[PDB]
Amino acid sequence: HHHHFNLPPGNYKKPKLLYCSNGGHFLRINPDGTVDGTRDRSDQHIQLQLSAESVGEVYIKSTETGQYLAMDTDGLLYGSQTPNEECLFLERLEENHYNTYISKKHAEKNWFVGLKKNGSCKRGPRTHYGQKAILFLPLPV
């Protein structure tokens, strides 16, 4: 293991909005496969269904389009039509409150899912423990 194992509470029974405490944006997987953030709660591409593959390992899927959140070899988030190794994330509790998502494939490099204050996603190498960009709160839809 390259990381701790404090897990967040809550389950995967229903879809969620992944709210980023940094700028207040909700993670969005666009129909064209791009990933960013939006403050518009009415957006139809921010409803995400998480599922557990192994304890603490999850897929994050758009309920609207079926795409899986994934992080590519250069650290960019994208929407994948099919589940692959780039789609698995280590879901952990952070600062005794938030959920963080580390790329399983790049776990040794500490690459996280993160949103900047302007709504753009962070590239894996630019994320790290301690940032506000990596902190999320799963809100009901």
Swiss-Prot record:
Stored Pfam families: FGF
SMART domains for this protein: FGF (SM00442)
Effect caused by changing residue 122 to A: Loss of LRRC59-binding
Record annotation: effect of changing residue 120 to E: Decrease in LRRC59-binding
Processing and modification events after translation: In the nucleus, phosphorylated by PKC/PRKCD.
Subcellular localization: Secreted; Cytoplasm; Cytoplasm, Cell cortex; Cytoplasm, Cytosol
GO BP terms: activation of protein kinase B activity; anatomical structure morphogenesis; angiogenesis; branch elongation involved in ureteric bud branching; cellular response to heat; epithelial cell proliferation; fibroblast growth factor receptor signaling pathway; lung development
Record keywords: Acetylation, Angiogenesis, Cytoplasm, Developmental protein, Differentiation, Growth factor, Heparin-binding, Mitogen, Nucleus, Phosphoprotein, Secreted
Family the entry assigns: Belongs to the heparin-binding growth factors family.
Function summary: Plays an important role in the regulation of cell survival, cell division, angiogenesis, cell differentiation and cell migration. Functions as a potent mitogen in vitro. Acts as a ligand for FGFR1 and integrins. Binds to FGFR1 in the presence of heparin leading to FGFR1 dimerization and activation via sequential autophosphorylation on tyrosine residues which act as docking sites for interacting proteins, leading to the activation of several signaling cascades. Binds to integrin ITGAV:ITGB3.
Quaternary structure, from the entry: Monomer. Homodimer. Interacts with FGFR1, FGFR2, FGFR3 and FGFR4. Affinity between fibroblast growth factors (FGFs) and their receptors is increased by heparan sulfate glycosaminoglycans that function as coreceptors. Found in a complex with FGFBP1, FGF1 and FGF2. Interacts with FGFBP1. Part of a Cu(2+)-dependent multiprotein aggregate containing FGF1, S100A13 and SYT1. Interacts with SYT1. Interacts with S100A13. Interacts with LRRC59. Interacts with CSNKA, CSNKB and FIBP. While binding with LRRC59, CSNKA and FIBP seem mutually exclusive, CSNKB and FIBP may cooperatively interact with FGF1.
Name of the protein described by the UniProt record: Fibroblast growth factor 1
Organism for this UniProt entry: Homo sapiens (Human)
